[PDB]
Amino acid sequence: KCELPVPAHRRPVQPRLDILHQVAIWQKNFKRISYAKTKTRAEVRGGGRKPWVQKGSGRARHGSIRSPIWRGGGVAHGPRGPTSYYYMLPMKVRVQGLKVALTVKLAQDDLHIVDSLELPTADPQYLIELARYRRWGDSVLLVDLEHEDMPQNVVAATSGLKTFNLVPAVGLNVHSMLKHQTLVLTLPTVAFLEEKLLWHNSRYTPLYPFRLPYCDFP
């Protein structure tokens, strides 16, 4: 049963593609630091002297021989230094993106709930035949609540598989759900995620960050 108060106008269950796009692009972009530095005409090794006189030579006028017109000269604009692409999409938009991602994967029949996540064996061929019999698509993202509580049979079965990926519940996000063709949730992960996402609708704005101790928040 749902452990949170459901609103009266909506019955419990047994989409924002724009926000999905925003969260996916943000996850792609915020970790990017572009490592591309080219040398402008100040940073090129030589070319500190006029090669010929200004007038009377008969050829074109030039200053440094390291200008961007010349062959071995510097680059006029180029990529300059390590370039950091860091921006933070706000907290409610990220929460809403997770919400609509879970809603889309529930409505597209790719979200499967598995009780307590045990396997009879550590053979990954068992997982492959289970997915082929249930027609779970190609790729499966299994979640668990905590990293150290994960069962060893499931861990040994998934550590050698490419399309099967096991992640803790804190590592679940929109890029992972849109990458994997099928999402698998455990019931305590459902109870954890429902609280962690439904808290933000009735919350305040932070006076100081939530790692500092609030009254009703840890």
Binding site: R10, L17, V104, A107, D109, L212
Partner: protein
């Protein structure tokens, strides 16, 4: 409810292969290439503007500038030392109380106002606290024990019409930062310092009983409360016979910032415990 989920079954799988931004969210960039944007590309034709050497923003071309021909007059002279007070309406107060953001059972001050997010105080913008403003004097029905930094007579009359307590206190900007953000001060590992006295300009506002200053003589308080009632035509309630009189009589020492705390105390919130000094010089300093 969400009928788009019914249509989402027939559509193929949502992935990274099919993701569109919102139409209109991105205005596409235009680059200086081609016949449409070329051979001058938005920079004009010769002159100083194509070479980009055009002068500064206030420069008018050798003519004496408009921002330099006007004579100086002090508009912002002493603006960094003028005292600021964030307003709080009685309509906003009654809205917070009726929505349960703040409660009248506990004595209400700027701390619980910030905690209920009714006002925001920026001490580094040299605010000195919260002033009561009288916009909602007609529709105010709450009984409060309100602690502000500045008050007006219509707001005061509106509060002791209902039978509340109005008193006005000074805070130094250090003590006001500590007041508005106690938990960021509580993770500083510093003893609570003394609340400071007002300056020479702010002595008489807190010394007279007409403004309900804390430092005023309490014997001059009831004649002021009855003069407000005589002026504004309401019967003055007997607060001593109320059941919440021990709540409404709760005050602060002029050298004390918080309720129930004292200067020199150190709050270790990891152990949920309190440290007190015992040195005679330390007690003389933090009690002086």
């Amino acid at each position: 409810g969400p009928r788009a989920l019914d249509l989402l079954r027939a559509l193929p799988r949502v992935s990274l292969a099919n993701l569109k931004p919102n139409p209109g969210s991105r205005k596409p960039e235009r680059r200086p290439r081609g016949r449409r944007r070329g051979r001058k590309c938005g920079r004009g034709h010769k002159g100083e503007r194509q070479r980009g050497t055009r002068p500064r923003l206030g420069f008018e071309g050798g003519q004496t500038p408009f921002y330099l021909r006007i004579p100086k007059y002090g508009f912002n002279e002493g603006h960094s030392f003028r005292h600021q007070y964030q307003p709080l309406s009685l309509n906003r107060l009654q809205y917070l109380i009726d929505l349960g953001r703040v409660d009248p059972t506990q004595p209400i001050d700027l701390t619980q106002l910030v905690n209920g997010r009714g006002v925001t105080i920026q001490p580094s913008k040299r605010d000195y606290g919260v002033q009561l403003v009288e916009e909602g004097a007609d529709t105010f029905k709450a009984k409060v024990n309100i602690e502000v930094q500045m008050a007006s007579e219509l707001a005061i009359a509106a509060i002791e019409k209902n039978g509340g307590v109005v008193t006005t206190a000074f805070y130094d900007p250090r003590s006001l930062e500590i007041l508005c953000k106690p938990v960021p001060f509580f993770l500083r590992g510093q003893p609570i310092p003394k609340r400071m006295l007002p300056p020479e300009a702010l002595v008489p506002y807190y010394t007279d009983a007409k403004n309900r200053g804390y430092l005023a003589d309490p014997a001059r308080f009831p004649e002021a409360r009855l003069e407000l009632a005589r002026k504004y035509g309401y019967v003055l309630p007997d607060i001593t016979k109320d059941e919440l009189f021990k709540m409404l009589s709760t005050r602060k020492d002029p050298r004390q910032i918080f309720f129930g705390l004292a200067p020199g105390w150190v709050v270790n919130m990891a152990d949920k415990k309190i440290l007190k000094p015992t040195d005679e010089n330390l007690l003389k300093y933090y009690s002086s």
